[PDB]
Amino acid sequence: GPHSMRYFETAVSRPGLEEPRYISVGYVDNKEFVRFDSDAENPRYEPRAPWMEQEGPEYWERETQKAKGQEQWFRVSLRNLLGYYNQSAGGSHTLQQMSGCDLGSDWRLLRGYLQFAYEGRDYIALNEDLKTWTAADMAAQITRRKWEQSGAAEHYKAYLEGECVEWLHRYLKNGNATLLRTDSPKAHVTHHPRSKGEVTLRCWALGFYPADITLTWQLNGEELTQDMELVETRPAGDGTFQKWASVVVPLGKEQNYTCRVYHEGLPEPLTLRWEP
């Protein structure tokens, strides 16, 4: 029973637009719970799960001012980065940030996170020690030296060990019914004839949460990389997820094939096969 919190932040500059659009999204255990967007009429952080309406107006006023601060920080940084990469006016650019904490099932901090990307690529990141920085790009070295000289790492470390953990604990108590549960996958196999003397067996899994899942096919023993087709896990749109995996099989010898579904809601892996 581990836990996590993240804020995913994005600022996008576009050619003629006056100034960048800034979006921040907060997540508790990988579920969205707050959101700010500078394109709204009255830009404010907003609840995105029912359990967050417990928070009084001082919570929302403070987080909103923080967001407006972040917006200005991303605006100046975008400007600085344009100069660092000798990019000219008239293009589109992106600055992103992930930050947050992971807790063990004892609710102790497992790991802190602080990373940035520019144009969708690693720019700079705080290492797991919460003291040193990784920056690959020559242009990013300028930021690394600046942040090393100002003691930025100490500032982010205090947030990640302090507030991030403290307020995550408070959120986990407040939403203890909503995001404790999981939905087990319900699975079935469909049959689909094809090119003479062969058929595809499609193993479906439906209605599961969270998204993490594995579907394997077995020829009475070993797995199958031998053209096992599959799809990426996809949202149903109602909070659950879907996935399938398939394998080409001789017609008649289809009961030598078994599909297994591995999901954290299951008491044990499901085993399954085609049934007329």
Binding site: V34, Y45, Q70, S77, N80, S99, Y156
Partner: peptide
């Protein structure tokens, strides 16, 4: 509770 950033890039 969201982070607030330190020095700009």
């Amino acid at each position: 509770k969201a982070v607030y950033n330190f020095a700009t890039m």
